[PDB]
Each structure stands twice: as structure tokens, then as C-alpha cells.
Design an enzyme around this catalytic site. Structure first.
Site, PDB file in Angstrom:
ATOM      1  N   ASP A  44       1.929  12.416  12.993  1.00 32.31           N
ATOM      2  CA  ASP A  44       1.053  11.874  12.155  1.00 32.31           C
ATOM      3  C   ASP A  44       0.300  10.708  12.338  1.00 32.31           C
ATOM      4  O   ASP A  44       0.383   9.748  11.500  1.00 32.31           O
ATOM      5  CB  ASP A  44       1.907  11.757  10.621  1.00 32.31           C
ATOM      6  CG  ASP A  44       0.906  11.488   9.588  1.00 32.31           C
ATOM      7  OD1 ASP A  44      -0.433  12.104   9.699  1.00 32.31           O
ATOM      8  OD2 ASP A  44       1.285  10.944   8.508  1.00 32.31           O
TER       9      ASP A  44
ATOM     10  N   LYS B  90       9.902  -1.203   2.365  1.00 30.86           N
ATOM     11  CA  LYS B  90       9.292   0.002   1.841  1.00 30.86           C
ATOM     12  C   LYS B  90      10.511   0.588   0.937  1.00 30.86           C
ATOM     13  O   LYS B  90      11.582   0.569   1.296  1.00 30.86           O
ATOM     14  CB  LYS B  90       9.074   0.862   3.004  1.00 30.86           C
ATOM     15  CG  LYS B  90       9.247   2.349   2.344  1.00 30.86           C
ATOM     16  CD  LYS B  90       9.310   3.323   3.709  1.00 30.86           C
ATOM     17  CE  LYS B  90       8.050   3.317   4.799  1.00 30.86           C
ATOM     18  NZ  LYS B  90       8.324   4.480   5.555  1.00 30.86           N
TER      19      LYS B  90
ATOM     20  N   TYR C 121       5.245   8.800   1.835  1.00 29.21           N
ATOM     21  CA  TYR C 121       6.485   8.564   1.924  1.00 29.21           C
ATOM     22  C   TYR C 121       7.022   7.887   0.657  1.00 29.21           C
ATOM     23  O   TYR C 121       7.302   8.413  -0.330  1.00 29.21           O
ATOM     24  CB  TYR C 121       6.854   8.044   3.007  1.00 29.21           C
ATOM     25  CG  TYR C 121       6.335   8.615   4.537  1.00 29.21           C
ATOM     26  CD1 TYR C 121       7.195   9.443   4.909  1.00 29.21           C
ATOM     27  CD2 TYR C 121       5.148   8.075   5.074  1.00 29.21           C
ATOM     28  CE1 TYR C 121       6.738  10.108   6.119  1.00 29.21           C
ATOM     29  CE2 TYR C 121       4.560   8.901   6.273  1.00 29.21           C
ATOM     30  CZ  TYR C 121       5.504   9.635   6.717  1.00 29.21           C
ATOM     31  OH  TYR C 121       5.318  10.559   8.050  1.00 29.21           O
ATOM     32  N   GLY C 122       7.069   6.280   0.741  1.00 24.74           N
ATOM     33  CA  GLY C 122       7.466   5.494  -0.147  1.00 24.74           C
ATOM     34  C   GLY C 122       6.516   4.325  -0.352  1.00 24.74           C
ATOM     35  O   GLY C 122       5.205   4.216   0.222  1.00 24.74           O
ATOM     36  N   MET C 123       6.641   3.555  -1.199  1.00 25.24           N
ATOM     37  CA  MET C 123       5.902   2.325  -1.650  1.00 25.24           C
ATOM     38  C   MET C 123       6.392   0.990  -0.842  1.00 25.24           C
ATOM     39  O   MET C 123       7.497   0.759  -0.542  1.00 25.24           O
ATOM     40  CB  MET C 123       5.923   2.030  -3.040  1.00 25.24           C
ATOM     41  CG  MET C 123       4.981   0.814  -3.447  1.00 25.24           C
ATOM     42  SD  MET C 123       5.086   0.827  -5.252  1.00 25.24           S
ATOM     43  CE  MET C 123       3.986   2.423  -5.653  1.00 25.24           C
ATOM     44  N   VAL C 124       5.183   0.538  -0.322  1.00 32.88           N
ATOM     45  CA  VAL C 124       5.330  -0.815   0.632  1.00 32.88           C
ATOM     46  C   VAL C 124       4.924  -1.948   0.120  1.00 32.88           C
ATOM     47  O   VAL C 124       3.944  -2.162  -0.649  1.00 32.88           O
ATOM     48  CB  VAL C 124       4.641  -0.385   1.922  1.00 32.88           C
ATOM     49  CG1 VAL C 124       5.743  -1.015   3.046  1.00 32.88           C
ATOM     50  CG2 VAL C 124       4.655   1.057   2.384  1.00 32.88           C
TER      51      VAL C 124
ATOM     52  N   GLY D  89       0.923  -1.312  -0.048  1.00 27.43           N
ATOM     53  CA  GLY D  89      -0.166  -0.018  -0.004  1.00 27.43           C
ATOM     54  C   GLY D  89       0.901   1.125  -0.101  1.00 27.43           C
ATOM     55  O   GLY D  89       2.011   1.263   0.233  1.00 27.43           O
ATOM     56  N   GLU D  90      -0.044   2.388   0.010  1.00 25.11           N
ATOM     57  CA  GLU D  90       0.395   3.669  -0.056  1.00 25.11           C
ATOM     58  C   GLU D  90       1.769   3.979   0.383  1.00 25.11           C
ATOM     59  O   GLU D  90       2.552   3.250   0.599  1.00 25.11           O
ATOM     60  CB  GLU D  90      -0.583   4.657   0.355  1.00 25.11           C
ATOM     61  CG  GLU D  90      -0.297   5.803  -0.080  1.00 25.11           C
ATOM     62  CD  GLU D  90      -1.468   7.059  -0.336  1.00 25.11           C
ATOM     63  OE1 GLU D  90      -2.728   6.588  -0.235  1.00 25.11           O
ATOM     64  OE2 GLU D  90      -0.842   7.742  -0.873  1.00 25.11           O
ATOM     65  N   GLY D  91       1.818   5.304   0.925  1.00 23.97           N
ATOM     66  CA  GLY D  91       3.154   6.153   1.477  1.00 23.97           C
ATOM     67  C   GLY D  91       3.486   7.286   0.804  1.00 23.97           C
ATOM     68  O   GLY D  91       4.060   7.209   0.068  1.00 23.97           O
TER      69      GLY D  91
END
Ligand SMILES: Nc1ncnc2c1c(I)cn2[C@@H]1O[C@H](CO)[C@@H](O)[C@H]1O
Ligand code: NA
Length: 352
Positions: A143, A48, A30-33, A26-28
């Protein structure tokens, strides 16, 4: 049996031979996990992909996340099993953080089922047990929300993504009216749109306050289109601020905005949440105070009667030492940040 580069979405995930069989988790922002099979530990893990370097801000956030997670060690906090990156500074394009694989997150869970007062209570405890450990090092997650709260099949819970994390420092917290921020809007403490940069543990208490109401109703509290609207959704439940409560609010615009808002009486929790434990409702109330100075601390929260079944002071570890950062790092060329990230990850190099 070579290959490598499996691609999750349409991006490369160069982590083989160790890990293969990648699957997008999923999302992030931040980055991709993704999840993958670790061939040495012969078990599936989460990994990630962070691709900063082309943005100084991302570089900062990535470095903070790494440095903190590498130094933290707590059951209710996700650790780092390994870190993959190029053996050459020049060739390093991204960083791969390998972490223990968790089954789900609190957000996916809330969308699938109604939690019992028992589940709600236990997850709150855990979140707070981790929060205590984090704050002890004077770190602020900033967050906290349902997706950043990973959970496994055994109900275990560990806090997520510290990309927006920073050290307290209530000295530089005042910022002025309507000064925006990055954290997820629905979980922003009201003082964020009024006069705060969110550099104090109170910011984390509010978020958790929102998460508790959320586990209690399977819905946000406080959504908001719409910055500012967010500020209005809050006042909708909290009612118009108390005089001295402001007030505390000397910001011209902030004080005038609030002043121009039609008087609104507070909505009793037991009203917006009929059929919810009173003990839990009392804690919530103490987490969602309009004033950050009156907000309950992470420690008094754990000592709150609603958690009396889990509360255990000699089994809720604290940080060994507080943390502090630059000192310059905020205003530094992203490339110098690439070196710090390349150094911080050095120890995981199968070589240098
Ligand atoms: N170890 C893990 N196991 C399972 N899922 C994970 C992790 C980690 I690190 C993150 N995530 C999921 O990816 C989302 C984006 O950060 C997060 O919101 C969360 O959904
Ligand atoms: Na994460």
C-alpha cells in the site's frame, strides 16, 4: 494535575499522564493518528490509536503491523517507541502505538509545492533504501503511496502503515479476473484487476512507479473513479499489451476483456512529462511495466544511474532474517488474535 482523556475528534485518547496536549494528525483507514507531548522524553511524538477486536480482519492487520514494525529497524522505516494498552485482557479496548513524530507526509508536500529534480531524486532513493530493507525480509507493503511516506523538516523519509503488509509467496498469487482488493486503487498494479493477489515484490515496485510519476507532476497518474477504470487509465498510458506480454494471461475473462479493448499506442514518458530528467524517466519506465515479470527489482532500481549520487551498497542495510506467518492465522477467531496482540505488546507493559 490529573485528567486524561483529551479526545481527538470525538474519540478518547487515554494515554496520559505520559502524553498530553493531543492533536489530530490525520486519517488512517487503519487507526487515528495524533501528536502529543511525551512528558518523560519531554518531546512531541506521534501516537496512533488502533481499535480492532470487533473485526477479525482489523485484528489481523493490526497484529501484522505490530509484529513487523517491532522487528524492523531501519532509518527509512518508522519504528515503535512504545505501545500502550490495558493491563487486563478483558479491559483492553485499543492499542496505542507511540512513534517518532514526523513533520509531514509526501502527499501533503506534493499538494503544497513543486519538487525539484534534486528532491525527487533523494526521496526516491530513500523510499527504495527502505523498500530494499523490507523486501529483504520478504515482506510486501502493498500500500505504498504519498501519504504512507512520512518526511521531516530535514527531508528525512520513512515508510508508513504496514496494515496491508504480507509475506511474498508467488505460489498463491493467481486469483482470476476482476477479483477486488483493499489497497488504494490509484496505485494498484494492472495485474491486480487481471490475475494477481499482489503477493510478490513486483506489486511494490509499481506503486513506487506511481509515486515517482507523482513527484514529477504533482498529480496521480492513473487516478480512476472506479475499479476497472483504474485498469483503463493504465492502458491509456502503457498502450495495448504486447502479444506474449499478455500472455502470461490465460484467464478467460481477463484475456477477453483486454482483447475487446480498442488498440492503444504507448504514450512516450518524455511526452506526458516534458522537462523531467531523462535518467528519472528511464527508471520510471522500468518501474511501470505492464508485465510484473519484466518489472525492475528494488536492487537494480537503486543501482539505476538516476540514483548514482546516492547509491552506496555498504550503506543500505538489509533484513537479518526473512519472515513468515500462519499457517492458520488468516482463518482464526478474532479473540485469539487479541491475545497475540496482547502478548506482542506485553514487553512494553510497565508491569506484566
Ligand atoms: N509519525 C507520524 N508523524 C506524522 N504523521 C504521521 C505519523 C504516522 I505513524 C502517520 N502519520 C500521518 O497520519 C496519516 C494516517 O495514517 C498518515 O497518512 C500520515 O499522514
Ligand atoms: Na502510520
Amino acid at each position: 494535575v490529573p485528567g486524561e482523556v483529551e479526545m481527538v475528534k470525538g474519540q478518547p485518547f487515554d494515554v496520559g499522564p505520559r502524553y498530553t496536549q493531543l492533536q489530530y494528525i490525520g486519517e488512517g483507514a487503519y487507526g487515528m493518528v495524533s501528536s502529543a507531548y511525551d512528558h518523560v522524553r519531554k518531546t512531541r511524538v506521534a501516537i496512533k490509536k488502533i481499535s480492532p477486536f470487533e473485526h477479525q480482519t482489523y485484528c489481523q492487520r493490526t497484529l501484522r503491523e505490530i509484529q513487523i514494525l517491532l522487528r524492523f529497524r531501519h532509518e527509512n522505516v518508522i519504528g515503535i517507541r512504545d505501545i500502550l494498552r490495558a493491563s487486563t485482557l478483558e479491559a483492553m479496548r485499543d492499542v496505542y502505538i507511540v512513534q517518532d513524530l514526523m513533520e509531514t507526509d509526501l502527499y501533503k508536500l506534493l499538494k503544497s509545492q513543486q519538487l525539484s529534480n534534486d528532491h525527487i531524486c533523494y526521496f526516491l532513493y530513500q523510499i527504495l533504501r527502505g523498500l530494499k530493507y523490507i523486501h529483504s525480509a520478504n515482506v510486501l507493503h502493498r500500500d505504498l503511496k504519498p501519504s504512507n511516506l512520512l518526511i521531516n523538516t530535514t527531508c528525512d523519509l520513512k515508510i508508513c502503515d504496514f496494515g496491508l503488509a504480507r509475506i511474498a509467496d508467488p505460489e498463491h498469487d493467481h486469483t482470476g479476473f476482476l477479483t477486488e482488493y483493499v489497497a488504494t486503487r490509484w496505485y494498484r498494479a494492472p495485474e491486480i484487476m487481471l490475475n494477481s493477489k499482489g503477493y510478490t515484490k513486483s506489486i511494490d515496485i509499481w506503486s513506487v512507479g506511481c509515486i515517482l510519476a507523482e513527484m514529477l507532476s504533482n498529480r496521480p497518474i492513473f487516478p480512476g473513479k472506479h475499479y476497472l477504470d483504474q485498469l483503463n487509465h493504465i492502458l491509456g498510458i502503457l498502450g495495448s499489451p504486447s502479444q506474449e506480454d499478455l500472455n502470461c494471461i490465460i484467464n478467460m475473462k481477463a484475456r477477453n476483456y483486454l482483447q475487446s479493448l480498442p488498440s492503444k499506442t504507448k504514450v512516450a514518458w518524455a511526452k506526458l512529462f516534458p522537462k523531467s530528467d531523462s535518467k528519472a524517466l528511464d527508471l520510471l519506465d522500468r518501474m511501470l511495466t505492464f508485465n510484473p515479470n519484466k518489472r525492475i527489482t528494488v536492487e537494480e532500481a537503486l543501482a539505476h544511474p538516476y540514483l548514482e549520487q546516492y547509491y552506496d551498497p555498504t550503506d543500505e542495510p538489509v533484513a537479518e532474517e526473512p519472515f513468515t506467518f500462519a499457517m492458520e492465522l488468516d482463518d482464526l477467531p478474532k479473540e485469539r488474535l487479541k491475545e497475540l496482540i496482547f502478548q506482542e505488546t506485553a514487553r512494553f507493559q510497565p508491569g506484566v
